[PDB]
Amino acid sequence: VLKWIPRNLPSCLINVESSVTSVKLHPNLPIVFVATDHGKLYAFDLFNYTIPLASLQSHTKAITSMDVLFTNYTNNYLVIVTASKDLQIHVFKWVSEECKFQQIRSLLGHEHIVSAVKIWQKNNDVHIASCSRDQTVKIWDFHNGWSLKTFQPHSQWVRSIDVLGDYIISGSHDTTLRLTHWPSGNGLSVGTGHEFPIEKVKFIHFIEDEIRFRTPSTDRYKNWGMQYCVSASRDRTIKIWEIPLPTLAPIPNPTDSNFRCVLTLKGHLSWVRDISIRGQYLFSCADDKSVRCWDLNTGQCLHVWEKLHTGFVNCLDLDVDFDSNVTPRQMMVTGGLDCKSNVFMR
Amino acid sequence: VLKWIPRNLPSCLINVESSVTSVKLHPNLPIVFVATDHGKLYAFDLFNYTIPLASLQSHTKAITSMDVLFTNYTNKKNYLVIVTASKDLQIHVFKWVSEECKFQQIRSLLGHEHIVSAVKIWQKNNDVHIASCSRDQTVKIWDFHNGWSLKTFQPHSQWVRSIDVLGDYIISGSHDTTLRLTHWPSGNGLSVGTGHEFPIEKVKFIHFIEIRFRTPSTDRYKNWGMQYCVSASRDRTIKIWEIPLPTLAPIPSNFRCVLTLKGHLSWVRDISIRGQYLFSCADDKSVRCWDLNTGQCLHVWEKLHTGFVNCLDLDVDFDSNVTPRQMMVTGGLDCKSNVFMR
Amino acid sequence: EVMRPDIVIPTIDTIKHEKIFYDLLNSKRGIILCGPPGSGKTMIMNNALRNSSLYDVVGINFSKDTTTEHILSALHRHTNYVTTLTLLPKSDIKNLVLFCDEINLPKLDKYGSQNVVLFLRQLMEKQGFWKTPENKWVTIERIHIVGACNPPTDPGRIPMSERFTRHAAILYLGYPSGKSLSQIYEIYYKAIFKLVPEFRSYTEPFARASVHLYNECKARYSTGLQSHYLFSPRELTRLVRGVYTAINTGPRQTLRSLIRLWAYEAWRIFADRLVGVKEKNSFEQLLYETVDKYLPLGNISSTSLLFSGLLSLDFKEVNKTDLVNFIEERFKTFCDEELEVPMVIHESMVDHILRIDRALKQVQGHMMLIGASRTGKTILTRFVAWLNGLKIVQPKIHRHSNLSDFDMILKKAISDCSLKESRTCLIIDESNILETAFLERMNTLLANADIPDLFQGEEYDKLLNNLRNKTRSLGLLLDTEQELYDWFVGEIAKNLHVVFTICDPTNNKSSAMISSPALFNRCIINWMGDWDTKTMSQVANNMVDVVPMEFTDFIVPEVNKELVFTEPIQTIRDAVVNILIHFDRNFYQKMKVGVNPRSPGYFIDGLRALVKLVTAKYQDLQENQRFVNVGLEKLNESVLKVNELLDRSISLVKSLTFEKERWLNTTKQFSKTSQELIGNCIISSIYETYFGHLNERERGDMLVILKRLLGKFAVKYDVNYRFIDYLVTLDEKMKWLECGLDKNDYFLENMSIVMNSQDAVPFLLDPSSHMITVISNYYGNKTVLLSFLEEGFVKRLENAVRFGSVVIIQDGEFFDPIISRLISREFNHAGNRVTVEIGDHEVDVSGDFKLFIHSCDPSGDIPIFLRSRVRLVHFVTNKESIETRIFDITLTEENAEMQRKREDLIKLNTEYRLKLKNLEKRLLEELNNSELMVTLNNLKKEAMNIEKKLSESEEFFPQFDNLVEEYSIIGKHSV
Numbered sequence A: 001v002l003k004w005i006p007r008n009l010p011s012c013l014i015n016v017e018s019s020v021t022s023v024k025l026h027p028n029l030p031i032v033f034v035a036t037d038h039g040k041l042y043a044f045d046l047f048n049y050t051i052p053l054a055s056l057q058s059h060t061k062a063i064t065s066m067d068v069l070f071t072n073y074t075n076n077y078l079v080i081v082t083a084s085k086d087l088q089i090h091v092f093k094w095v096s097e098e099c100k101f102q103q104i105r106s107l108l109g110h111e112h113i114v115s116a117v118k119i120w121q122k123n124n125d126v127h128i129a130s131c132s133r134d135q136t137v138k139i140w141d142f143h144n145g146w147s148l149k150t151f152q153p154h155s156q157w158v159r160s161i162d163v164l165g166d167y168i169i170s171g172s173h174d175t176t177l178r179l180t181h182w183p184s185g186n187g188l189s190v191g192t193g194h195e196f197p198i199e200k201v202k203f204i205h206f207i208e209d210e211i212r213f214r215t216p217s218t219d220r221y222k223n224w225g226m227q228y229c230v231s232a233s234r235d236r237t238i239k240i241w242e243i244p245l246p247t248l249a250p251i252p253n254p255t256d257s258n259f260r261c262v263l264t265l266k267g268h269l270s271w272v273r274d275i276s277i278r279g280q281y282l283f284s285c286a287d288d289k290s291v292r293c294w295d296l297n298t299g300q301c302l303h304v305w306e307k308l309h310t311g312f313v314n315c316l317d318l319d320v321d322f323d324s325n326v327t328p329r330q331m332m333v334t335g336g337l338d339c340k341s342n343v344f345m346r
Numbered sequence B: 001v002l003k004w005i006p007r008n009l010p011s012c013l014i015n016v017e018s019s020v021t022s023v024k025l026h027p028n029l030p031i032v033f034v035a036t037d038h039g040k041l042y043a044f045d046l047f048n049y050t051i052p053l054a055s056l057q058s059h060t061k062a063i064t065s066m067d068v069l070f071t072n073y074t075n076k077k078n079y080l081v082i083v084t085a086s087k088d089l090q091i092h093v094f095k096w097v098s099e100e101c102k103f104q105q106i107r108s109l110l111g112h113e114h115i116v117s118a119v120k121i122w123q124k125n126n127d128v129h130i131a132s133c134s135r136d137q138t139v140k141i142w143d144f145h146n147g148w149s150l151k152t153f154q155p156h157s158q159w160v161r162s163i164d165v166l167g168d169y170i171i172s173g174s175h176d177t178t179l180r181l182t183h184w185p186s187g188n189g190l191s192v193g194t195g196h197e198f199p200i201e202k203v204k205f206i207h208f209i210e211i212r213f214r215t216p217s218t219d220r221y222k223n224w225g226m227q228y229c230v231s232a233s234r235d236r237t238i239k240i241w242e243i244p245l246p247t248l249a250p251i252p253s254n255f256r257c258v259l260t261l262k263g264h265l266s267w268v269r270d271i272s273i274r275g276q277y278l279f280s281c282a283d284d285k286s287v288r289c290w291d292l293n294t295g296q297c298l299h300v301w302e303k304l305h306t307g308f309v310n311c312l313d314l315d316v317d318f319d320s321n322v323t324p325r326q327m328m329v330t331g332g333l334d335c336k337s338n339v340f341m342r
Numbered sequence C: 001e002v003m004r005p006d007i008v009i010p011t012i013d014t015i016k017h018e019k020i021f022y023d024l025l026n027s028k029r030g031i032i033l034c035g036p037p038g039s040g041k042t043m044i045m046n047n048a049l050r051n052s053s054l055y056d057v058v059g060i061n062f063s064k065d066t067t068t069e070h071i072l073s074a075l076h077r078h079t080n081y082v083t084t085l086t087l088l089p090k091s092d093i094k095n096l097v098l099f100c101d102e103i104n105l106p107k108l109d110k111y112g113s114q115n116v117v118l119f120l121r122q123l124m125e126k127q128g129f130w131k132t133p134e135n136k137w138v139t140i141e142r143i144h145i146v147g148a149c150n151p152p153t154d155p156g157r158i159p160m161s162e163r164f165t166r167h168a169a170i171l172y173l174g175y176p177s178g179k180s181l182s183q184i185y186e187i188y189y190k191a192i193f194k195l196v197p198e199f200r201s202y203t204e205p206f207a208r209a210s211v212h213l214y215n216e217c218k219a220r221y222s223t224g225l226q227s228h229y230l231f232s233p234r235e236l237t238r239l240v241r242g243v244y245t246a247i248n249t250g251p252r253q254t255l256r257s258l259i260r261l262w263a264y265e266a267w268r269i270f271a272d273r274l275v276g277v278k279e280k281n282s283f284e285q286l287l288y289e290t291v292d293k294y295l296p297l298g299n300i301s302s303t304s305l306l307f308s309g310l311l312s313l314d315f316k317e318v319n320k321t322d323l324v325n326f327i328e329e330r331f332k333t334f335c336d337e338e339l340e341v342p343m344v345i346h347e348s349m350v351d352h353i354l355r356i357d358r359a360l361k362q363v364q365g366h367m368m369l370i371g372a373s374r375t376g377k378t379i380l381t382r383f384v385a386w387l388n389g390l391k392i393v394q395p396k397i398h399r400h401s402n403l404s405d406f407d408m409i410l411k412k413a414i415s416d417c418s419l420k421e422s423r424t425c426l427i428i429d430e431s432n433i434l435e436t437a438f439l440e441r442m443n444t445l446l447a448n449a450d451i452p453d454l455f456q457g458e459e460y461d462k463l464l465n466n467l468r469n470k471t472r473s474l475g476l477l478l479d480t481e482q483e484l485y486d487w488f489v490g491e492i493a494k495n496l497h498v499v500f501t502i503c504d505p506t507n508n509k510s511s512a513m514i515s516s517p518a519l520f521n522r523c524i525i526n527w528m529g530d531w532d533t534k535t536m537s538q539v540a541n542n543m544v545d546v547v548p549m550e551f552t553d554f555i556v557p558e559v560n561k562e563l564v565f566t567e568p569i570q571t572i573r574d575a576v577v578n579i580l581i582h583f584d585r586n587f588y589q590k591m592k593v594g595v596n597p598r599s600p601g602y603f604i605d606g607l608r609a610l611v612k613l614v615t616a617k618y619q620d621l622q623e624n625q626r627f628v629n630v631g632l633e634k635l636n637e638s639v640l641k642v643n644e645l646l647d648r649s650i651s652l653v654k655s656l657t658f659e660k661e662r663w664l665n666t667t668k669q670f671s672k673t674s675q676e677l678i679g680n681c682i683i684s685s686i687y688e689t690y691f692g693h694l695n696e697r698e699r700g701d702m703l704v705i706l707k708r709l710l711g712k713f714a715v716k717y718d719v720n721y722r723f724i725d726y727l728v729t730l731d732e733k734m735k736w737l738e739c740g741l742d743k744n745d746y747f748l749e750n751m752s753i754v755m756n757s758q759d760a761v762p763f764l765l766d767p768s769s770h771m772i773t774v775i776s777n778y779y780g781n782k783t784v785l786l787s788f789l790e791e792g793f794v795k796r797l798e799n800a801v802r803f804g805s806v807v808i809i810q811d812g813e814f815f816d817p818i819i820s821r822l823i824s825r826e827f828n829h830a831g832n833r834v835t836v837e838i839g840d841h842e843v844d845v846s847g848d849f850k851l852f853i854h855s856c857d858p859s860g861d862i863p864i865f866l867r868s869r870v871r872l873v874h875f876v877t878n879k880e881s882i883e884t885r886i887f888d889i890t891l892t893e894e895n896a897e898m899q900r901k902r903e904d905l906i907k908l909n910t911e912y913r914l915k916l917k918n919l920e921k922r923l924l925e926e927l928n929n930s931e932l933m934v935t936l937n938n939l940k941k942e943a944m945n946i947e948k949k950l951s952e953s954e955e956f957f958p959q960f961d962n963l964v965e966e967y968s969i970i971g972k973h974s975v
């Protein structure tokens, strides 16, 4: 159930009006949501891909990123939020009674194009992350609708973010990584080693199922909850970084203020666009119309999807396995610049 | 899959400026192209039908026919080609640029001496040819890459009202009750068929599918690939004829009516076949579905529009590159269109 | 070891020259090394001095402008001033050898003397010099002098004084023989092919092929053809290094792959500098002959050889189509990220991108782009630097700039390259060299990998502090002065790439730039030149395939094969592309451009103007024809309904007979207007983008040429075509005439050209400065008048950009090069906010901001950057304007009441005609939107009243005709 590898040929293909920038998987029902460079937002059920379910033009510009979340409470619906180049982040509501999109509201506060959003639930309260081209990470509240904290983690505009509890990692256009603790809003460590802008960075969440990089080393790393980070850039390389232990509002150690590249996965023919972690395998795509599958233990590519798209492969994702609220089903969908999307079944 | 039954009630209601002339469905996306009697062509979304995606005043007169297809080039970027015919004695070629959702007018086709009545477009391995018919008693065959005519001849004494293209053979329906199948590369007739008493409305070929009419009879028929055809006229009867095999440039001899249909209360306008069921509308504002095996009407969709029904669009199930989506759109003269999704 | 420049292959001549050079140097005598360029004087010197622990080499490269101060500045970091004054070397055990390259280059004054030559002869004969500021005599103790030069018969060289060469021992270094060169490069090819052992037996034939190719290139392409056709063994070693790099960073090779790779390297080394297509074909045939003779494989053209590491992890030959698609997507991303420019990616664009990438991927690899303006030099350089991760530094050299600003920019770039390890691409335009001191600074920067004049005294000491701190940061263990500055030089050489943009290579400044010694021998000369007709065909097709063009019957004309530059004619599109290419060629032929490169800016501007104008014209024509058709249909339906089955409606129907006749006539002539639409649009676009700087006679002759050329390709045009009747509307005409335009048709055409230019900043040549007050009347109080000759102009321009005022800049002959991004329409978009960079800080473009440039001086100085990117309009008085002004003056001074009545009558008549036209348009609009009968009757009555007013007012024309006939002789004598 964990060592599943997708087949060499997709079973169903999704056709979209323009370039597909982001795709997301519904944790519960077999339906995939598809973004569009033209500005539309689609949703296709996994079994009848001939026609969509709902599609509206909410953003006046190209969607840059989106994500999904199934809320839970101790006292319960899918929340989808979409960023774009239209200087506004739109929050929607997915009602399964009618399977129709319902807009909740729109968010403002950025001075340039926003490129990444992350949503997480903490104690019956959810927050939406956001990084934009104005060099600020303005993460916002879904309930109140106002801002919470604004900070500048890089000298150049931030291209991707990821949230693991109270910690956020940021990858920017200045070929550096910076880890900042959000509630205090202070930088903790700086990660250098790339020479081309970062495309996507995310945490390596701990798993309990023996993957080398998904397990804590010592007791302190297990207590902190995180040890390793994975990042991709325009270097045609994927690098595995490690978080040095801070002095613990954590205090950045002067002698432990730098990262360390534990591994450097290479073999792509162009810029690595998006990455995903499933068990011991790392799934990545690039502009070479190819998708790799990097084993974490061996640090070597296992399966290559030659010419999956006729153009660039913008995005892909898997099901999250580090969270018990979402069952890690064997679904993977890849978005392409050739106005097409491929979904692999079982 | 291909045995789906359309819903009893319509799912979408889209309003146009004037009477609907021709309706075509985008083979890949929920997009419907509709042309009005004023010459304006519209692009409506199936999920947002309140406002069009793009509108262009293509022709200055009433639209007669419209056909769309997606090019499949082995080398070159793929795009969809819209060919629209009107009473302006000219046919324009369009292109759906879905990146910004607009219309680009690639080129036009001039040379017809009357109002072009019907169009039919097909794609070869690396070439695209344009077929048309007008009231000048001629069927002019054009080329999409070049832009000038490659074949022009008179297939019938009267004015041709419909035409169908399948490979190198074209079946033309005229104002006279007789038809004629002619070779396109040679420009010579092969066979003729009569039996009707009213002018022909729409004649379309039948493609074999791997059914009584979609299965080859002998090895020679399979090698030829064309054995049966469908015709319609104003006599409220749709008859399926049999195409004889000429002595093979082919050298030309009568069409035998192996089946007939009755029950239409008015003159039929469009005929659509999806799998083993054939759907056709008429001026009685009713849509009848007839199975090819039993040869009788199964389901009826009456009181669809106040005015007469103009045309209906169905995805081709005989094309590998075209997905047989479960959707059908029918247009009427009441400035409205009906969509049955799933 | 091929990369290392310190390797020398020991031959007989090499060891002989090296040991006699050492014997001469150990005898404490001056040495001058002479010979043709590329002989190996520097090579034999360095080989002799590497094996010695007794001497150090200080490299100074002389140019046309070298002073004693440069020699002393280059000696600052190597020598110490002691009072025992005496100038010892800093080292106590090693002597210092002052090596002076290109020593003939320091020019003479007006009295035939060289400052540097006399300084050096003072240094050798007297062993010292006089220190200028304190007037004291220093003594040279342990410094030797070695000179390198070319024979005086070489161009740019001057004879030296006999007092100089009397103290110097002269050795002549000649070119090695073909056999010796073959042996040298067969050793090099063995070293290269050690990486590919399966082809180790082909090293010798490759060496003979390369040497024969070099000899044939030297024989065929001589200095007498072009001044930069100087070949040397340096070309051969460059080719060898490129071959080694290509196999080193490439996949497993075959014999065909090796031969094609060697041919590609030969193309990039020997044939990049070729100017004419004849020499390109000669080199192609030469490569064919060399391969057949020495290596007994497909096509060996420049476009057929496309080796690139962009599409894969290794340097290899790639397909054209996938490379074009990859470059298209990458340039889309580049337009998104840095600057939005609507460029078309063509085959020669791809080849130039590949060779610029090849140059920028090297170490100590520079570029010298020579070609016409608006060819895509700096934008391609920035795109390639973005692809390679380099930082683009364009110096902000403007008017009122001196040595201090350029030295500051260079020092900042050097510090970023070395201390901050910022890999930098430095783009130096030919207009950024204000005087020859800038060129000398760049010569010093290129010859070495440092500028010793920029680091003196306390600046030198603080540079040492910064570099010591940075070296401690990296952890390298070095503390001495020599090793630290060598690390400085190595970092500068590794991280700095210089690209030169040259538009007119026949200018004296550009000729000195090309013929500069270090610029010639270090940069990779890439003669891009003007666009060949294939490139123009490709880009024209790629910008006219997205516009509705073919909507009428088209017959292919019978024309010669040599006169068709596109694919064989099949549509109107190919005919239009060929027509535009032919008119561009005819235009540049009739303006006697000569050997000056022909800029394609006119072609691209004409293409864009044609596309937008035909799109607008097609939309307007379709809308108008649809309106006429629906109006006629509605009138016919109303008539039929009235006939089948209310007096106001009957009267309205009866009164619409003339309107129905007009609609019928327009419907009948719709076919004729559709026949000639494309030709009219083409002629219009030619008017805006070509005829701005032409008088009426040149415009008429060129229109005749364009008309016959457009009729040649079976394209129809309006026989009675007129620019005013096509682009100038009545409302615009009245606005211009009440603003102050003259009645002259040439001025109306110029005003239409300047107003309908919404994509290029216009340029005005009005000696009378009338256009200034005309435009100030056009925009009223929102206009602002700035000038390049006034202080604080930058702040005023930035404030006007923020507010959105219409800006007119006088003194157009004094162009200020920091508004270049405004001139080139280089804007940065931040959502709904559009910003431009002026000076040193970004400023927000309001969107209502407009730019006009005015110049009242005819035959002034306009830089090629400004000249090629403006709609330059000439406002020069002609015979008709002089006659009109003379008649106006004589009528005002003779009978003022008659003149006032006549001008008031003309204004009333034209205003009534516009009212009638707008009333007809309103009638058509109201009829299309269908109380109403009463409104239509009122409109018809108003139209009848206007017609009666015109009929009554047209009775005073004979008096004006008689007055014109009376004063015509005065007007003609005045002109």
Ligand SMILES: Nc1ncnc2c1ncn2[C@@H]1O[C@H](COP(=O)(O)OP(=O)(O)O)[C@@H](O)[C@H]1O
Binding pocket: C007, C008, C009, C010, C011, C014, C036, C037, C038, C039, C040, C041, C042, C043, C044, C176, C184, C233, C234, C235, C236, C237
């Ligand atoms: N052993 C050798 N004998 C002769 N020439 C050589 C030898 N090795 C290399 N060369 C060539 O001599 C050239 C050196 O020329 P260079 O010294 O730069 O010219 P200049 O003497 O004008 O400075 C190199 O480009 C190289 O190709």
Ligand SMILES: Nc1ncnc2c1ncn2[C@@H]1O[C@H](COP(=O)(O)OP(=O)(O)O)[C@@H](O)[C@H]1O
Binding pocket: C341, C342, C343, C344, C345, C346, C349, C372, C373, C374, C375, C376, C377, C378, C379, C380, C501, C503, C539, C604
């Ligand atoms: N391949 C191309 N297609 C279209 N336009 C081009 C192309 N190359 C250059 N241009 C025109 O040249 C301008 C930029 O060229 P640039 O590199 O600045 O030339 P230069 O270096 O001679 O000043 C642009 O405004 C563009 O319109």
